[PDB]
Symmetry: C2
Subunit: 207 residues, 2 copies
């Protein structure tokens, strides 16, 4: 049982999962992040299929993550791996390729996918989609990368956190957040206090 | 797929479910509410077993809802019906019997149960336990019955709502809340606005 979440914003992408977060990169050219909610076998099978084609593909017509000209094509690669791993839950796949905006996708068991938009700028995967009502109401596509990360982190209620900045083509802001992290506890405590105050205000309204 | 929730407070009990809410009453003596999250067959089987003993029991030693001297005994009756309906998800059962405080229970598939306390004053049932993180942070046992109802209603994000006032032994405050209810939409809109403001405040805090 795992939970993972990702946000597409104007300033880039943010990924979080409580391994369940996988990274591919060609410096200055392309970056990809895959989040998994499935069991260990399912995750390893999909990753191994992706890496098999990166490491051993003889046919140059077969698209890999490193030959895909755009993120829609890169998403199809992952979808093929997801569909093909069934012969042995959803995934989240995002990133950026040079000459195109950062893009984010949710991939279903059969390899079909939907893309994140400004209207629906985030995806959740896992058995329980923790804090979906809060994310629906508060998440906005013009948020700073740090804001979005804080909002995502509050929905985890272990945590590997990646912030990807637009047009950098590298993942440097990588972070493991523990349950013993005092910063994360102060944020969570403040959120509880803010929720109680928010409810106290809206108590004004009837039925 | 159903969701139901109930709160035990100083001033009484509140029940809500999106039939999935069942009522028994002897005026001035005892009141009982059962919430179901299961399919229609499972709910009807448990209710029919309860009613069978109320309507046809020949053995006076067999405890029914109307002979139970206290709510712990009443909970065991429901637990017996829940366990026995397996030979054809959790339930929530609460109420009050004369001479005792209002009490609230969560009943598991095998008929065993746990009781609500001031520390843990609510239960949720259903496939997805919507808004559990909000309820955990905001719910308090000293809330007014209307406050608790508003908090519960916001977690539904169809809705049959019962408020039971302590020592009355009747259910008069009964209400069906629609998705087209303009009061409920104003409360939900205000909650969204309050959540965004609450998040804006706590953005101050780092990682
Ligand atoms: Na805005
Ligand atoms: Na209080």
């Amino acid at each position: 049982g795992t939970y993972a979440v990702a946000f597409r914003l104007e300033r880039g992408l943010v990924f979080a999962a409580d391994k369940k977060l996988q990274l591919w990169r060609q410096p200055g050219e392309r970056v990809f992040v895959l989040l998994s909610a499935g069991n260990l076998a399912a995750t390893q099978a999909v990753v191994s299929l992706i890496n098999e084609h990166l490491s051993q593909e003889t046919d140059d017509e077969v698209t890999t993550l490193f030959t895909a000209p755009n993120m829609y094509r890169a998403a199809r690669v992952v979808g093929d791996a997801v569909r093909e791993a069934r012969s042995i839950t959803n995934f989240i796949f995002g990133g950026q390729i040079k000459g195109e905006r950062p893009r984010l996708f949710q991939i279903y068991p059969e390899g079909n996918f939907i893309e994140a938009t400004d209207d629906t700028p985030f995806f959740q995967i896992g058995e329980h989609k923790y804090g979906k009502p809060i994310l629906d109401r508060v998440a906005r596509s013009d948020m700073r990368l740090g804001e979005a990360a804080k909002l995502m982190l509050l929905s985890f209620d272990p945590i590997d956190l990646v912030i990807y900045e637009r047009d950098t083509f590298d993942v440097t802001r990588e972070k493991r957040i523990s349950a013993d992290d005092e910063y994360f506890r102060n944020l969570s405590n403040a959120w509880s206090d803010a929720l109680r105050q928010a409810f106290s205000k809206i108590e004004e309204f009837d039925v």
